[model samples]
Target: MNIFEMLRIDEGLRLKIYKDTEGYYTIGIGHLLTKSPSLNAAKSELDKAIGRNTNGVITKDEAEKLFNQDVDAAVRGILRNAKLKPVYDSLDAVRRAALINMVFQMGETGVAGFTNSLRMLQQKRWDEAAVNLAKSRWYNQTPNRAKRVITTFRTGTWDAYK
Candidate 1:
């Protein structure tokens, strides 16, 4: 998948002002990140991933590999540890994909800042969650993108940004 597929239309983010769970200066497709590398220490492995992106600028193919590694960690590690099984249990793949992108954009703790949104999600209040999503600082930071992800949440469509 490409960066857009991996990170929604929000790949070119506050790259310079970001950090992963491990506290690494993050880059393309959540490519550089982590504080305590779990998911088999995947971030450590990804930190040593294929070809590096020069100062966070990457080619399409490089972005694909990093996207794969990035997505894996969020689904397998971040969300799992966040204790969000209700989301995984209640939502389909597409809805989960959108939330994964949210998790990718904001780390698990960042998502924690959106307790009402998460609670709305847990209660399966999708439309409300979608609305709450757009009302957040994330939406304030990325307007169109928040719209896209909220659409995903609202409709359970995986290709919302595609």
Candidate 2:
């Protein structure tokens, strides 16, 4: 099953997922509720939260309008912070997309903080980049999620399940 299917996320939730990578959708008490209109609202709320979250500080209003823009700014923030111009210059669409995905999950600061990974990327060292990517706090903190995205970034193979 696709990651969405495996996660049991419905279309509305998919829209939410597309917009906000973080934030959980739930009923009254955080019991995850999939395929609901509320998911859409939650997604909107999450989009708003992105800017504030990324900068480590923001107003409540800015945090409320993250998804208003069509482009996912959160993803852009990650890419920009990673200094991905070289990757953008060299990699194909798939690889670029995978890198963006990694940034999305890991956050700009989180990924860019990897000195080894950043150096490898700067030097166009794919193997070293892969190794450094694998050696992340995310990898140590959330192995399953980290492995899935890192594999995609390393191999340019999309595993939507990640």
Candidate 3:
């Protein structure tokens, strides 16, 4: 096959921060993955490592790749976590996206910390899940964003916010 460009396959050009397969952090274009950091100190230490210097701007192509990677990770986590795998797997992309987005924002520990919420979700109970989602530190901390997320949780739609 003819080569389309030098910046093809397994090449880094996004220059944005994102987690790898097992969730270790990676960043930038080319050989910039150094702090890019070392150790588990890697991901969380970004401000001190990556962003403090130059302007932290990534391309649209880069951001999209990051988003897709995250969505994939979140869905896998959704299947891995929920007691009802088939039910979660059966959800529409929107509903599943809602859950994945929640998990992405809050992390598994934080989202799962929504014990009441999980109880509702586990039961396939949307209303209770909505109630539990609203009645949390998460909702209180980020009402606007939480509302968007909660609507998706409650309504099982992707475009509720937009």
Give the winner by TM-score. Answer: 1
Residues 6-61, model 3: lDDT tens digits: 11222234565665433545554231232333544444453444344423445555
Give one digit per residue, the lDDT tens place, for model 1 in 1-162: 342454735665442325543455555556654444343344344446654434434455665666777778777754465556566667777777777787777767676567788788878898888888887777886777778778888887656566
Model 3: runs farther than 4 Å from truth?
1-55, 82-87, 90-92
- CA deviation > 4 Å runs, candidate 2: 1-71, 78-82, 159-162
Give the whole-model CA lDDT for all candidates, comma-separated.
Answer: 0.65, 0.48, 0.56
TM-score of each: 0.67, 0.51, 0.58
Q: Compare candidates 1 and 3 on lDDT and give the better one.
A: 1
Q: Candidates 2 and 3: which is better by lDDT?
A: 3
* Cα lDDT over the full model 2: 0.48
In lDDT terms, which candidate is top?
1
Pairwise TM-score winner, candidates 2 and 3? 3
